[PDB]
Every structure is written in structure tokens, then in C-alpha cells.
Write a protein that binds this ligand. Sequence first.
Ligand code: HEM
Ligand code: HEM
Ligand SMILES: N=C(Nc1ccc(CCNCc2cccc(NC(=N)c3ccon3)c2)cc1)c1ccon1
Ligand SMILES: N=C(Nc1ccc(CCNCc2cccc(NC(=N)c3ccon3)c2)cc1)c1ccon1
Ligand SMILES: C[C@H](O)[C@H](O)[C@H]1CNc2nc(N)[nH]c(=O)c2N1
Ligand SMILES: C[C@H](O)[C@H](O)[C@H]1CNc2nc(N)[nH]c(=O)c2N1
Ligand SMILES: [Ca+2]
Ligand SMILES: [Ca+2]
Ligand SMILES: [Ca+2]
Ligand SMILES: [Cl-]
Ligand SMILES: [Cl-]
Ligand SMILES: [Gd]
Ligand SMILES: [Gd]
Ligand SMILES: [Zn+2]
Lengths: 404, 403
Amino acid sequence: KFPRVKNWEVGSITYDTLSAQAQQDGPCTPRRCLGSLVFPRKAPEQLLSQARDFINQYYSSIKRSGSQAHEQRLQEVEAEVAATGTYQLRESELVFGAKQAWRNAPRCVGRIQWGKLQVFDARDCRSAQEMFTYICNHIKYATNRGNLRSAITVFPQRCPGRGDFRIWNSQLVRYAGYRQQDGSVRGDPANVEITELCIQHGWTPGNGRFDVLPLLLQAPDEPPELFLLPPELVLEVPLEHPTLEWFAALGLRWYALPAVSNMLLEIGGLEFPAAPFSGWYMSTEIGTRNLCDPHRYNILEDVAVCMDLDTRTTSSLWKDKAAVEINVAVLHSYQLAKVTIVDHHAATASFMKHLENEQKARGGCPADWAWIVPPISGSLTPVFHQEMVNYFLSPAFRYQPDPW
Amino acid sequence: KFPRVKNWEVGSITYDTLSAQAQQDGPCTPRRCLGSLVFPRKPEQLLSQARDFINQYYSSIKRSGSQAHEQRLQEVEAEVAATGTYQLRESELVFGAKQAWRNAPRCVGRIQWGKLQVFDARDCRSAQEMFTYICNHIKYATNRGNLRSAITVFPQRCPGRGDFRIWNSQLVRYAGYRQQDGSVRGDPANVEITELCIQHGWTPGNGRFDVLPLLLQAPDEPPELFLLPPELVLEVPLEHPTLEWFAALGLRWYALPAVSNMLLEIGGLEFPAAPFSGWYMSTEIGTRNLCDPHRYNILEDVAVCMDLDTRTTSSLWKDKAAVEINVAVLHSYQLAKVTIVDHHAATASFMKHLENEQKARGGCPADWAWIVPPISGSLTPVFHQEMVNYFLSPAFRYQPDPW
Ligand code: HEM
Ligand code: HEM
Ligand SMILES: N=C(Nc1ccc(CCNCc2cccc(NC(=N)c3ccon3)c2)cc1)c1ccon1
Ligand SMILES: N=C(Nc1ccc(CCNCc2cccc(NC(=N)c3ccon3)c2)cc1)c1ccon1
Ligand SMILES: C[C@H](O)[C@H](O)[C@H]1CNc2nc(N)[nH]c(=O)c2N1
Ligand SMILES: C[C@H](O)[C@H](O)[C@H]1CNc2nc(N)[nH]c(=O)c2N1
Ligand SMILES: [Ca+2]
Ligand SMILES: [Ca+2]
Ligand SMILES: [Ca+2]
Ligand SMILES: [Cl-]
Ligand SMILES: [Cl-]
Ligand SMILES: [Gd]
Ligand SMILES: [Gd]
Ligand SMILES: [Zn+2]
């Protein structure tokens, strides 16, 4: 059987036939579900089976399955693997593969956009200095003076006999987190480790709550090299609230461009350890997680006090009221600055449209309910009432160990 | 083999060793996770479940393997040889009811699991006696608004005989009436049972909060219609502490959440009629029942009264209206002196339960999607807690509708 999947708002029913194609295994068993875990995980013949599957996907996408070109590319990959132990993607295959990896990412609510992705081919990159040039070009294109455009830059693939390219930073733009001696943190606690590594590698630190980190860039078989981003390249949004004028005096800001730089991109059995990608923010990422998580900036109580809320009892719902107003400030501030942002209602609505498209196109869509449902207002969004099937398809974005 | 479980707010690590004991199989496989599905499940066997429950029982009272332990085992064997089933002792039933609550992965209120009043109704015959047992349960559990958790256990399923069943999904439900513009006056969830009460001879109301009659079914008989005495059904009119117009919306909800359509399984025995009640968490009423698009769906009405900008989602009018409805629910129950818990207090208590259960049993089955509240998810501590979901017995299970 194929899993039956129900939308409880509408009563509609589908069957996820795509999940039967899932190859790599997740952490669940019939005995117990581990769907809530953040980390679900941790050769010529196996390489070829993955390469063949990918080539088949490519020729399907362009409606040329079983063509002469399809058969000849399969044979051509077979011969390169037999000769050299590996192979190279065509340019067209790289573009398709990166879009597919995005399409396949189960925790991404933004996948209505998956076919609109600018793919920068950096597979000729030969040094950390040239890496930095590719990255600056990526940031300039993607930022586009606030009219954000999705993009990925793909650095050379992993290969035996040479180290990996790696970007040590988790995102291209991140705020420093200065671990204080009391155990407290000035800045973003999520970035304490990379801040200390930047210092250890010669960066002169600041002492602000929103200090932009330098990049630690690793070329093959080299220690990371420190590069500072041009200030003119890093677009930031000061946070203000449309009706609470004192909010501006909190001195809060966030950056325009979310650009994840520490995930591994896998295409047809080839691995790209350095392949940063960027899109635009959903406002709850900044307003709810980044600013209100107890272990991040943790501003909820400060705002609630300023709002004159009764923070002495849970039943006043002061936390909920303060969080709503912080999210309003984020949205208002980005819209005022003319920087692309999407609220969680519009994002989840577009994701429901994506599920319907993917049901027609492929018979299902891998989706991680706990990550698709926003961190506030969950059941006020349509995805809350939509059952979802989580599984791993390739091409894929994957977690990888930190390189230090 | 023992899953590692992390809290991402605090960094602490535990290992769930209890999941190794999971008796039945869930819907997930290494190929694909089906954790988000509401319904995960579509002689000699009775004895083995019966045996292992008796073993559980004696271990929990520190009488493991001793003298009375062997006597009870041999009694159940002789019982099933003669009759094809067996009888629980009253204390085994109490223990099994509490364990089934303690084991329920989707219940955020399990800090309370050790405090449960068990009404033994296994001597019941006829719907008229069911109705009397149910009325006594409601009166006890409501307790003038100082709610007390209770379960009434009706006779078990046996071979060659029908079941007792409560056709209603809860003891207190609001009617849902269809109209010729497609829509529903009342609760859309209860349209089916509303027309069943009408079919079996109930004169319907015309309100949005008409309390339904009870449809009680004794074995091998049609169900019988019973009216709940109005003074037995404690309701709470909803008002807001500062929005004076909120009262004029005419919203109400009832005090006692009393689930009456789930099956209780203990030692291989099955009780298809075993209603249980606790008290509400505020988001159940204010977010799910009142704001779900397929329930009362009042969110846009409240937002319009609040003069919010409903033409763009980016004003967050839905979020603001939701918070004030939840405020109204909390204020109204507290003013009426009816027990209620807000989602912040409830999730903090469930974290304490997780710590207690780690020490007691080495883990605790928990369904993240149902434990995290439907508003302000990440503002509660359970959001950042990884959880392991698995099926233990004794258990509460879904069952087919009697029709
Ligand atoms: C264009 C607008 C986009 C929006 C609004 C969006 C939104 C999101 C959000 C809210 C998450 C959850 C992240 C978290 O909670 O940390 C996510 C995850 C993810 N996104 Fe998207 N995204 C967008 C574009 C992209 C693009 C262009 C890519 C890759 C080409 C991408 C790939 C991913 C991946 C791989 C994850 C999973 C991360 C993980 O598992 O930790 N997204 N996205
Ligand atoms: C005393 C206060 C209690 C509170 C605050 C509470 C809270 C909750 C909540 C919020 C849910 C989610 C239900 C939904 O969203 O539809 C739930 C589920 C559940 N509760 Fe509790 N509960 C309480 C008492 C009890 C008792 C006394 C029992 C049984 C003896 C029980 C057994 C269950 C079961 C079996 C479920 C699973 C429901 C399902 O899977 O459909 N609960 N509880
Ligand atoms: N578990 C650890 N932390 C940990 C693990 C996983 C995560 C997931 C964070 N994803 C950041 C992210 C990913 C994808 C999309 C967005 N958002 C966009 N809008 C966007 C970004 C690019 O395009 N669009 C944001 C975060 C922290 C850990 C601790 C030590 O080591 N690891
Ligand atoms: N199966 C159908 N829907 C369906 C299926 C499952 C559910 C789950 C709802 N559980 C109700 C419930 C269960 C447990 C606790 C509470 N709350 C308490 N606080 C409480 C109650 C008693 O003690 N404490 C509420 C709801 C609807 C269906 C389809 C067609 O028709 N019906
Ligand atoms: C324990 C839990 O899996 C973890 O906190 C998850 C829950 N869902 C999430 N969902 C999103 N979008 N982002 C997250 O970081 C998380 N964290
Ligand atoms: C699709 C999804 O599983 C479904 O809507 C679930 C999600 N989580 C829930 N959580 C609670 N507490 N109650 C529910 O009814 C649900 N519904
Ligand atoms: Ca070549
Ligand atoms: Ca008509
Ligand atoms: Ca207006
Ligand atoms: Cl982020
Ligand atoms: Cl309810
Ligand atoms: Gd003001
Ligand atoms: Gd007015
Ligand atoms: Zn699972």
C-alpha cells in the first residue's frame, strides 16, 4: 500500500506514492518514531546506481526519457566512472540537480519557489581568495538592493586525494556572539563557537550585539583564511514598531539575506561540501526564533515589560502578546526598508499550493510537519491540519560535521 | 538501540530505554515517517497480554514474582479456559486505567496521572443504567467547577455478545445543524451525531450551542436517546476582561471535557465504553474549537470587532484575534471558578512529568505534534524537547464508530 494522507480542514485525501522511491533511511522504525529529532542521521557500483538514477531524473524533467541522448549520457557516465572512479556533471545537470535538492528538502516551507533558483557554477575555483570573490558576487546578486533573489554557488566537488572546500560559517551573514565569563553572551549565542574561531584566527572583535562576523574560508588542504565582508554588501534592517515608538530604542536589527553555508549538496552520488544557498526570510524566523528563543537574543520579557504586561502570571498570555508585537515589528521594518520578507500565513498558504502541484507532478512531496508548521500560530495556518509524509530523496541538502 | 534525546534549549541529554518495551507497532518505517498522521493504526493471544499485564501489576507494588503473583496468573488461565476471557480485580482495573493514561503519548496533562477516580460500572445492564452511571460521573467530575479527573468503566467486550457503546464522541457536545446554503449552525464536528439524534427521535434546537442528547447503546439493542439534565451540564459564557463587546458575541463553552468514544485496553481485555474526563487546557477551547476553520471558525468575526486590518496577512490580524479569544477563555473560566490551565503552565508541568518519568521508567512516550500547543509553540519549553513516540499497553485506542 501507499500511505493515505488527509487534510483535516477540507477532508480531502491523497496517497503519497513518491515515498515508495525513498532510498536513504530515516531514524524511525515500527517500534518507535523519532520524527522530532533535529539530526535524523549520525565504491564504483554504488556511485553508478546513484548517478544512473540522477541522469534518469534529468532526462525525465526535460521530457526526453529513453532518447538517444539519455542512453548516451548513461554510457558516458559509466565510462568515466570505470576510468577514473568518479565523474563530472554537465552544466545543465548541475543546475537541475541544485533545484531538485531544494525541491526535495522536507523542512523547507519555501519550496513553491524551487524552479526559480540562480545557480552559479564555481567548480573551477582554485583558492580561498577566489572563493571570496564568488561569495561576494553571490551576495550582491541575491541581495539586489532589497529585492531578494534566490541563488546557490557550487564550489568544486569532493574527490579523493584532495581536501574539501568548506565555508566554516553556518551562514554568510551572522552576528558575533561573545561568550562572557559569567556564562552569559553578548550578541547571538548561536554563534559563540564561530566567533571564537574568528578571533583565534586573527579577527579583532567588537563588543556589540549585532557585529557582523568575517568569513572563514577553507581551500583544499589549507587552514581557513579570514575574509571581511564589504560593509556595502551586507544589507541590514533596523527594527521599529509601527505603533510602539519606544521599540526603536531597543536598538534591534537583523540582516536582509539568509544564506546557509554549512550544508552539503549531494547530486547523483557526487558531494559538494561547499555550496552556499540563499533566499529570503520568513518573518517568524527572525521575530520568534532568533529574537525570542530563550537561548538566542531572548528579548520577550524586556518587550513585555515595556508593553506594561503582567509578567508575573502565565495566564495573562504576556508571552504570546509580546511575541506577536515583535513579529509585527519585523514585518513592518522589512517592508519599510523595501527588503523582501514573507509572513508565516502567506508562506504556509503558498506551501499548500506547492503540495498540490507536487501531488500532480510526482505523486507526493516529502515534508517534515514539525518544521513546516511555524513556531507561533501553528493551527491558524493551513499546514497544521495537513498530514505529511517525511522521507529522503536525492539530490539533497544534507548536514555535515563542522570542519574543526 | 536506545535513542538519544536532546533538549535544545538547555543542552541536556537523556536516553529513552523504555521505548525498547514498545509492545505494538506504529506506522513509521526507516523509509518514511508517518508521525503526523492522526490515525496511525488501521485465545492463546489473550493469555500472553494478560500475563504481561499481571507481571506489570505486581512489579509496580513491589510484589514481583512472589506468592500472590503466581496465584493470580493461575486464576486467569483457568478463567479463560472456562469462559474465553477473564475478570480484572478492582485494583488491577484501577492500575490499568491509570497506566493507560500515563502511556497516552498525545496527552500533555499526564503530570496528573496518579490521581484518577475510577468508577467500576462492569455490572451494568441496559442503557438506563448507563445513563445513571454517566450522570453520576458528570456530577462527581464537575464538582461545581472544581474539576476532578474520573473514568467510568462499563462491561468489557466478550465473545458472543455485543458491546456497550456511547455513540457521542464526548458526553457534552454542541449540536451542528446543516442549512441549504451548505453551512452549519453550531459545531461542524457534530453534524453526523446531530442527525443521528434527530433520526432516533430528538427535537432539535436552533442555536449555535444546543447541548446534544446522549445516544447510549446496550449490547444487541438499538441506541436509546437520553437528555442530560440542564443543571448537570455546567457551561461558561465567554466574556473579555477589557473588550466589552466580546460578551455580545454570545460565545459559550462547557466545563467538562469527557471523552466517550475511545477504547480502553488492559491485559488483552477491551472496554469499548469507558468515558474519561479531566479539565481543559485553554487552547483547546480558544484556539482549536473556536478558531479552527472547520469548527466554529470565529477568528475573522473577532478581528472585525477589534477593527484589525484583515486585508493583508502581514498585519497578523489572525494572531492578535487568536490571543484575545484565548484571553477571554482564561478570564471567563477563572471568573466562573471552573478549573482550566493555560498552555504555558501545562507544558511546564509536562516537562516535569518527562523528568519524573525518566527516573521512574527510563523514558516516556510522547507525540511532539500533539504535545506542542497550537499557538505560541516555540514560546513553550516542549517545543525545544526531542521526543520518542511509541505504543505501550494498557492503552487508550481509537475504535470504529458504532454505526
Ligand atoms: C526563497 C525563499 C525561502 C524561504 C521563505 C524559505 C524558508 C525556509 C524556512 C523557514 C526553513 C526552516 C529553517 C529553520 O527553521 O532554521 C527552511 C529550511 C530549509 N530551506 Fe528553505 N526557504 C527559501 C529558500 C530556500 C532555497 C533557495 C534553498 C536552497 C536552494 C532552501 C533550502 C532549505 C533547506 C535545505 C532547508 C532545511 C534546513 C535544515 O534542515 O536545517 N530554501 N526554509
Ligand atoms: C486532567 C487534565 C487533563 C488535561 C489538561 C489534558 C490535556 C490533553 C490535551 C490538550 C490533549 C490533546 C487532545 C486534543 O488536542 O484533541 C489530550 C489528549 C489525551 N488525553 Fe489528556 N488531559 C487531561 C486528562 C486526561 C485524563 C484524565 C485521561 C484519561 C484517564 C486523558 C487521556 C488522554 C488521551 C488518551 C489523549 C489522546 C487523545 C487522542 O489521541 O485523540 N487525559 N489531553
Ligand atoms: N543542532 C545545531 N544547531 C542547529 C541545527 C540546525 C539548524 C537549522 C537552521 N537552518 C538555518 C536555515 C536553513 C534553511 C533556511 C533558513 N531560512 C531561510 N529563509 C533561507 C536560508 C537560505 O534560504 N532561505 C534558515 C539550526 C541550528 C548544532 C549545535 C552544534 O552543532 N550543530
Ligand atoms: N475521528 C474523527 N475525528 C477526530 C479524531 C480524533 C480526534 C482527537 C480529539 N480527542 C478529543 C480529546 C481527547 C483527549 C483529551 C481532550 N481534552 C481534554 N482536556 C480532556 C478530555 C478528557 O480529559 N481531558 C480532548 C478528534 C477528531 C472523525 C472523522 C469523521 O468523524 N469523526
Ligand atoms: C525538538 C524539535 O524537533 C526542534 O526544536 C525543532 C522543532 N521544529 C522546528 N521547526 C523549524 N522550522 N525550525 C526549528 O529549528 C525547529 N526545531
Ligand atoms: C495533521 C496533524 O497530525 C493534525 O492536525 C494534528 C496535529 N496536532 C494536533 N495536536 C493536538 N493537540 N490536537 C490535534 O487535534 C492535533 N491534530
Ligand atoms: Ca570530462
Ligand atoms: Ca438551494
Ligand atoms: Ca478597518
Ligand atoms: Cl536565521
Ligand atoms: Cl474538546
Ligand atoms: Gd504609540
Ligand atoms: Gd465600532
Ligand atoms: Zn516517524
